[PDB]
Amino acid sequence: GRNQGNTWLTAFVLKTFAQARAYIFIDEAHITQALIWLSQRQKDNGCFR
Amino acid sequence: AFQPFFVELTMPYSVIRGEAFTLKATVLNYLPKCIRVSVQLEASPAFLAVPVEKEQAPHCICANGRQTVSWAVTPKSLGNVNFTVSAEALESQELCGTEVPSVPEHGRKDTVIKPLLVEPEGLEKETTFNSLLCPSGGEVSEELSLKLPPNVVEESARASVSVLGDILGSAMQNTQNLLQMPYGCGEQNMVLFAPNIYVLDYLNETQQLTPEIKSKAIGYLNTGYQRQLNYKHYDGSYSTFGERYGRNQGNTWLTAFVLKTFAQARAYIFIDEAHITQALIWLSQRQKDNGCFRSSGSLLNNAIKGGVEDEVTLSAYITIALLEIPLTVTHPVVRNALFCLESAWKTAQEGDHGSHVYTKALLAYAFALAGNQDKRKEVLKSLNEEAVKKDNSVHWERPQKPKAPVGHFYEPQAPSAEVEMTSYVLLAYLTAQPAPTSEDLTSATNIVKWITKQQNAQGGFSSTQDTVVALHALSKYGAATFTRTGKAAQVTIQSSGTFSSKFQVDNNNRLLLQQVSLPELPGEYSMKVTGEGCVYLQTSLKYNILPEKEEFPFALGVQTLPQTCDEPKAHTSFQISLSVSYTGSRSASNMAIVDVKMVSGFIPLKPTVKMLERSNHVSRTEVSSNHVLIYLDKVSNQTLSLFFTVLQDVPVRDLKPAIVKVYDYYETDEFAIAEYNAPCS
Numbered sequence A: 001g002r003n004q005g006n007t008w009l010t011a012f013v014l015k016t017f018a019q020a021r022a023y024i025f026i027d028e029a030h031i032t033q034a035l036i037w038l039s040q041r042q043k044d045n046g047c048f049r
Numbered sequence B: 001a002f003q004p005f006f007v008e009l010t011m012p013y014s015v016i017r018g019e020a021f022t023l024k025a026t027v028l029n030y031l032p033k034c035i036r037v038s039v040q041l042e043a044s045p046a047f048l049a050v051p052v053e054k055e056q057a058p059h060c061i062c063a064n065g066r067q068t069v070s071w072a073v074t075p076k077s078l079g080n081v082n083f084t085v086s087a088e089a090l091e092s093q094e095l096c097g098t099e100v101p102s103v104p105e106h107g108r109k110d111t112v113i114k115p116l117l118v119e120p121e122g123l124e125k126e127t128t129f130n131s132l133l134c135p136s137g138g139e140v141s142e143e144l145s146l147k148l149p150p151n152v153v154e155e156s157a158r159a160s161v162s163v164l165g166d167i168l169g170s171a172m173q174n175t176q177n178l179l180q181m182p183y184g185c186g187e188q189n190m191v192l193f194a195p196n197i198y199v200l201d202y203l204n205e206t207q208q209l210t211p212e213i214k215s216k217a218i219g220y221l222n223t224g225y226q227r228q229l230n231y232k233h234y235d236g237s238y239s240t241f242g243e244r245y246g247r248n249q250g251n252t253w254l255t256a257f258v259l260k261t262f263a264q265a266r267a268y269i270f271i272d273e274a275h276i277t278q279a280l281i282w283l284s285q286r287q288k289d290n291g292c293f294r295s296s297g298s299l300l301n302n303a304i305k306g307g308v309e310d311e312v313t314l315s316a317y318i319t320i321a322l323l324e325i326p327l328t329v330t331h332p333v334v335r336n337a338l339f340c341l342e343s344a345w346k347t348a349q350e351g352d353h354g355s356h357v358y359t360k361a362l363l364a365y366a367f368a369l370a371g372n373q374d375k376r377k378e379v380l381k382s383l384n385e386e387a388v389k390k391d392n393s394v395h396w397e398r399p400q401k402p403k404a405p406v407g408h409f410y411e412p413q414a415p416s417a418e419v420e421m422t423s424y425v426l427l428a429y430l431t432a433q434p435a436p437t438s439e440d441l442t443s444a445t446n447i448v449k450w451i452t453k454q455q456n457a458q459g460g461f462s463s464t465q466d467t468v469v470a471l472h473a474l475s476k477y478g479a480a481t482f483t484r485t486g487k488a489a490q491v492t493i494q495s496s497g498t499f500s501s502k503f504q505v506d507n508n509n510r511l512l513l514q515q516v517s518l519p520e521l522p523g524e525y526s527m528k529v530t531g532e533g534c535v536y537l538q539t540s541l542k543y544n545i546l547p548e549k550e551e552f553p554f555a556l557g558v559q560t561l562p563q564t565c566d567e568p569k570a571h572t573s574f575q576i577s578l579s580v581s582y583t584g585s586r587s588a589s590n591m592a593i594v595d596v597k598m599v600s601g602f603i604p605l606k607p608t609v610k611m612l613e614r615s616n617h618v619s620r621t622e623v624s625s626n627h628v629l630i631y632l633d634k635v636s637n638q639t640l641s642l643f644f645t646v647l648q649d650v651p652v653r654d655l656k657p658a659i660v661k662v663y664d665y666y667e668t669d670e671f672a673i674a675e676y677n678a679p680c681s
């Protein structure tokens, strides 16, 4: 639950999900939930551990 | 256990203006001994007694001696009345037949005392008014004139007045019920879950309720939201069954209703912060840059929506959701639809028509969290001035005003409407960051009252659903009891007939109803108070109507019997066919309205069974056991009918008819009634 995860294979695609959100519909909600995961982890001051 | 002599009576019922019904009396001697019982009845000038068996005294009978003892009467007074008859045995009178013991114990005389009710002439209703006074250690007064007697009826129109603050919810018998995965179709899912979600807020917030029907509803809710996984849309929207409808909005109560409680429900089982924001991001997308974006209402069911498809009102219904989430740029966005509502409040300032449901709901909510919304402790007063159920019913008519723009007050949204309304009323009331000890309480506590007198868990309401909404009314009070409301409240009640009654209120008179009526056909009511803080007292004016009304728009097709009794067997048995529809039934709600009751002394059974069969391709198999409800199927394009009879419980009837007809179709139309009594006479 309360952890990060490796993020190449998503960040690699998370643009191409958006190049791939034309043939079949993955929504703007799948990219932002992918995103909102990230902003949560950004510390206010630190380069989060 | 034994007593040999027991009485049996004839119940008339709650019955007609005429009072010559068929009153009898029968006792039966189960003892073997044939004993005289001197009998009579203690009368009063409250009614117009008539002795049938004048000359002779019901005299004397034997073991299982059946006898009937029936006088006549024709009272004047209306309402419930205890009737006092007495039967006693005398000694040394061995002259009936052989002999007479006449020797009971302390259980000597058979005596019977019977509260029976008369329904007065015509049709019943009330009118009323609403008033507050709030001197802040000062003094204020007000004058109320209380009169709409057109088409006036003899000696029918009466009233009373009061105010209250009650604390200590006593009990919870309005609590319990259940329903579940329905059997007819999948469309009821919307009506299933929506109030079913706010049940979670009830377990601790009562100190009377039954939580485990709601702590099992979690075991249901642990599947509830699962249907909402499926009933959603991929893009973010929600429908009765979900996506495959892409670039549109959707109805948003049932989500916005929960989308907070999803967040109260994101503790037991984990729905993430991503499910609430995708729900949210759907919304921000639709907010136009400049306009109050165009949206049309033709969505999957008015079963869930007693609705008339006003996007702007719904443009607020998003914003309540926006208040839930603490994004705080969001909160400027609610000021957008606010200013869309600012139009709708100028509407609700003039007070002609804004549908009296919704700008209600959330204006209160809108700034509920902030802390400086004194301004909104005003605007509720409208809503409580807006024919609220101070009597704990919003009974049934508009004051006497025919015109085009009128409110959501006499519309075919027919759950009896007094519970749907007050929900979103009290939900507005006592979310006060400060003490709401001022006038948003003393009526709040009124709402506690009949929900605490709504003590029957049948569920066979004037609706089916609506009493699920009777509960939050009880619920949210559960901390509102933590309150103080008492000050130098000294109350003057004056009218024109040189009358003036005085009353007063305080922390211990806080919970004190001060009922008082007057006989005045005039209605004129000056009032004056003092003290600190505010308080809203209340009017109510009862009266009869329908002396004899004429024909009108609405078409009710009824037929009672073959045009006459004309036979000795009849006056008892005749099936009454009813065949009805009103065209104006357009994009407002489900079909809810009906009224079918008997005449004074007339009792149905196969009527129970003919309704039992009826299923005209859609139905809720609903029934009152004095009335009938299969209506949400379809409204009025193609009517339909049935037939049903009674048994004459009334051997003799003072000639005054009976009719049970209900009607509400459109905001401008005139009375729109069609009626017919029973003919056999």
Ligand SMILES: *[C@@H]1O[C@H](CO)[C@@H](O[C@@H]2O[C@H](CO)[C@@H](O)[C@H](O)[C@H]2NC(C)=O)[C@H](O)[C@H]1NC(C)=O
Binding pocket: B583, B637
């Ligand atoms: C009563 O039922 C009829 C059944 O045809 C409905 O007829 C439609 O009328 C509307 C409005 O004039 C048209 O838009 C439709 O083309 C007609 N049929 C449909 C729905 O496709 C009618 O709407 C119903 N109500 C009344 C009394 O107007």
